[PDB]
Amino acid sequence: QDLKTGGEQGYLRIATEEAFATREIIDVYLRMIRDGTADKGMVSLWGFYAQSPSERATQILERLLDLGERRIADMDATGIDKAILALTSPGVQPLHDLDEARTLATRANDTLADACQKYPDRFIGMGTVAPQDPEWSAREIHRGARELGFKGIQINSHTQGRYLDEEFFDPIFRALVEVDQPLYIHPATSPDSMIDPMLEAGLDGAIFGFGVETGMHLLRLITIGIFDKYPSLQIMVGHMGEALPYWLYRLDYMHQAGVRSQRYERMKPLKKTIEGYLKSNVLVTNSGVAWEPAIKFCQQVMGEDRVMYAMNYPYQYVADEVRAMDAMDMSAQTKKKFFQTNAEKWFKL
Amino acid sequence: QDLKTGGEQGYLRIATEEAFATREIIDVYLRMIRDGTADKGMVSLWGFYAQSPSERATQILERLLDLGERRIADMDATGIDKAILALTSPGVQPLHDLDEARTLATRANDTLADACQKYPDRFIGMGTVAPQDPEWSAREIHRGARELGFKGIQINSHTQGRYLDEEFFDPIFRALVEVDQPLYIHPATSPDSMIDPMLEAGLDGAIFGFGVETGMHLLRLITIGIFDKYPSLQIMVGHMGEALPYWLYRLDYMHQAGVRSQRYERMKPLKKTIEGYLKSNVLVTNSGVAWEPAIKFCQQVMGEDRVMYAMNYPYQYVADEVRAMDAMDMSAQTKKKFFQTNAEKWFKL
Ligand SMILES: COc1cc(C(=O)O)cc([N+](=O)[O-])c1O
Ligand SMILES: COc1cc(C(=O)O)cc([N+](=O)[O-])c1O
Numbered sequence: 199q200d201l202k203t204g205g206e207q208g209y210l211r212i213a214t215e216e217a218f219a220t221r222e223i224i225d226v227y228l229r230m231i232r233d234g235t236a237d238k239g240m241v242s243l244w245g246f247y248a249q250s251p252s253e254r255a256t257q258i259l260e261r262l263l264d265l266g267e268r269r270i271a272d273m274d275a276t277g278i279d280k281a282i283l284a285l286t287s288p289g290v291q292p293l294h295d296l297d298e299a300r301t302l303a304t305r306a307n308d309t310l311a312d313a314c315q316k317y318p319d320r321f322i323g324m325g326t327v328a329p330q331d332p333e334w335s336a337r338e339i340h341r342g343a344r345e346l347g348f349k350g351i352q353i354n355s356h357t358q359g360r361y362l363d364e365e366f367f368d369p370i371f372r373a374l375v376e377v378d379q380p381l382y383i384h385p386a387t388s389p390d391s392m393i394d395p396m397l398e399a400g401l402d403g404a405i406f407g408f409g410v411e412t413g414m415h416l417l418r419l420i421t422i423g424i425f426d427k428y429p430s431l432q433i434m435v436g437h438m439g440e441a442l443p444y445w446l447y448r449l450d451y452m453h454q455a456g457v458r459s460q461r462y463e464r465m466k467p468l469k470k471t472i473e474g475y476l477k478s479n480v481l482v483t484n485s486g487v488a489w490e491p492a493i494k495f496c497q498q499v500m501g502e503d504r505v506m507y508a509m510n511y512p513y514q515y516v517a518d519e520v521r522a523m524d525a526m527d528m529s530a531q532t533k534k535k536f537f538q539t540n541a542e543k544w545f546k547l
Numbered sequence: 548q549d550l551k552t553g554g555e556q557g558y559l560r561i562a563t564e565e566a567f568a569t570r571e572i573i574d575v576y577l578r579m580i581r582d583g584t585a586d587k588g589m590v591s592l593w594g595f596y597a598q599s600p601s602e603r604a605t606q607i608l609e610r611l612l613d614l615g616e617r618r619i620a621d622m623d624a625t626g627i628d629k630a631i632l633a634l635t636s637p638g639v640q641p642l643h644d645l646d647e648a649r650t651l652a653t654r655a656n657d658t659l660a661d662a663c664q665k666y667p668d669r670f671i672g673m674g675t676v677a678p679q680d681p682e683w684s685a686r687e688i689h690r691g692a693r694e695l696g697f698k699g700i701q702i703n704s705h706t707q708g709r710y711l712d713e714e715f716f717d718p719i720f721r722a723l724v725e726v727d728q729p730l731y732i733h734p735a736t737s738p739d740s741m742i743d744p745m746l747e748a749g750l751d752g753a754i755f756g757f758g759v760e761t762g763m764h765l766l767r768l769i770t771i772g773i774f775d776k777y778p779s780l781q782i783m784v785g786h787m788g789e790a791l792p793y794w795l796y797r798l799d800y801m802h803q804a805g806v807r808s809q810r811y812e813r814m815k816p817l818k819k820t821i822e823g824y825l826k827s828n829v830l831v832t833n834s835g836v837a838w839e840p841a842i843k844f845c846q847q848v849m850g851e852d853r854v855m856y857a858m859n860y861p862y863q864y865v866a867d868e869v870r871a872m873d874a875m876d877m878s879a880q881t882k883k884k885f886f887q888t889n890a891e892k893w894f895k896l
């Protein structure tokens with residue numbers, strides 16, 4: 199079963215959640231780990247990826263750092279026509295020195311824009327920001343859209359234990375709506391306030407902690423009414439929607455029960471059900487979930503227009519996953535939406 | 548009038564996750580709230596249910612405390628033939644005074660056993676323990692199985708921030724294997740080490756935090772190798788498996804990645820995949836999830852023999868949910884397993 203670029207099978211493969219790193223940023227993580235300012239998540243996640251002697255961690259690091267011929271080759275070998283690229287979690291979000299965070303985010307964005315320019319038919323950019331400074335972040339969203347050819351931004355969930363439902367972060371949403379671009383909420387390790395029981399069992403990372411953190415964050419945003427405030431805003435999440443589609447019946451039941459019993463001041467009546475917001479304002483990718491039953495479930499819940507293919511390169515670079523997706527028992531029209539035309543629509547490619 | 552007991556529709560309706568309270572234990576929660584020894588989760592959960600004048604809270608309290616004709620009338624009105632009853636979360640697990648914990652658990656168990664004796668064709672008991680004292684808990688498991696006629700025990704997830712994968716709790720598992728009975732791991736609020744970001748958003752309870760806490764607890768039991776140490780052990784969870792069936796592909800992928808890379812001391816090779824353990828040692832109810840797509844997904848993933856009906860009375864007592872379950876697009880044979888015969892098998896009714 200051959201994996202070829204060019205769309206001869208009836209669609210292009212557009213991979214919508216693909217990571218890169220910059221040497222300068224990984225070096226800051228290593229410095230933070232050495233000087234004791236790294237949070238427990240950073241020590242766990244980047245203490246491993248930047249310091250494990252294994253062939254595997256080593257290959258992920260090398261692949262993350264390449265934005266040229268090797269990445270193109272890996273894409274060609276798996277039949278990936280286009281990749282939507284974003285700076286790997288947690289970006290500059292954990293950094294205490296804001297001059298450094300803004301400088302390195304600017305440089306990461308510059309580097310990405312240069313790579314997309316060099317490979318305009320293969321690489322598509324999502325910008326990185328420094329939510330610590332929402333006003334600068336808003337300017338960088340405009341710069342991404344205006345000068346850099348970027349299609350949106352990726353935020354790596356929380357910023358130092360603070361979440362985007364806080365009014366403090368509103369300039370970011372204001373800017374996304376001004377440029378009419380989607381937000382990808384990508385996972386991160388939980389903050390120190392929440393991580394301990396997961397970390398002790400080995401569950402703080404992609405196995406579990408990622409989905410908890412990210413699902414929590416998107417749920418918080420839905421329930422604060424972000425989509426009533428910003429009805430045009432689209433938020434994309436990976437990993438088959440961080441379980442929210444499967445939890446949907448219970449989410450809506452318990453959300454309505456809480457509101458009606460006036461349990462939490464924070465939880466106020468919304469204009470739509472959570473189901474309603476999933477169908478109008480949330481977009482999902484299958485990153486890390488090359489599994490047909492889950493994909494089909496999620497298509498049924500959210501609509502086939504709102505579920506997209508993502509590989510999660512280089513953390514999950516598996517040719518047999520692409521093969522299993524190419525071979526799903528799904529109509530030609532639906533498969534082409536999933537691999538290609540959904541992404542083309544929602545990222546305005 | 549259209550929901551009837553007696554099984555004329557082809558099956559009995561056995562509700563496998565039904566709650567009661569004792570006044571004296573609720574009073575201890577109130578005391579702990581007043582004296583500042585309650586954890587944040589108890590304050591949130593029981594500060595609401597024991598004190599709110601809302602319709603939802605008052606009905607829950609009233610129904611939780613009844614183990615006689617009012618409960619029977621509520622069951623008759625919704626066609627529920629039998630209910631498997633357990634002391635409502637968090638039971639005695641948060642109590643600092645062990646003598647008090649052991650005493651109140653004993654009394655809750657004797658109270659339940661009295662009710663089952665009085666209505667033996669309607670009420671089935673799961674016992675409650677005090678995992679703070681694992682050895683006492685082992686003896687109470689003996690007593691439940693051999694003297695009180697109970698079919699298993701329910702543990703309300705964590706005990707004072709500690710999880711059952713610790714060797715400290717091993718006497719509980721030894722005892723369950725000895726009497727050959729299932730453990731139901733029911734939710735609780737997250738411990739103080741994890742709860743803050745959920746609590747601040749109104750998400751610490753059943754809407755989200757419950758699933759995070761219970762899924763993490765089952766997952767860490769699986770990854771520590773509990774089912775290799777005790778291959779006969781069956782662990783039941785509600786809420787459609789706390790999303791673990793939906794996450795399965797990601798869980799197995801990332802579990803294997805973590806094992807092979809030696810990332811974590813508590814994540815070593817297991818004899819089966821996580822999927823393997825779901826199909827041989829884990830059992831699921833649909834408590835809180837009266838939703839055909841999720842039920843069918845779960846049946847597909849774990850096997851239709853391993854998925855059972857639960858109402859979650861009184862937290863979710865909805866005649867229209869029972870009607871929706873009766874109307875599902877399933878064979879008569881599948882429906883009978885789901886409502887009746889799986890429970891008869893797994894609880895040894
Ligand atoms: C640093 O970012 C990631 C790390 C990993 C991992 O540790 O396996 C997974 C994904 N992911 O999306 O699942 C990441 O993007
Ligand atoms: C204190 O026990 C529970 C509370 C809630 C609730 O607050 O709605 C729901 C369930 N449940 O399992 O969904 C409970 O068992």
Ligand SMILES: [Cl-]
Nearest residue numbers: 586708738739
């Ligand atoms: Cl606690």
Ligand SMILES: [Cl-]
Nearest residue numbers: 803806807816
């Ligand atoms: Cl292996």
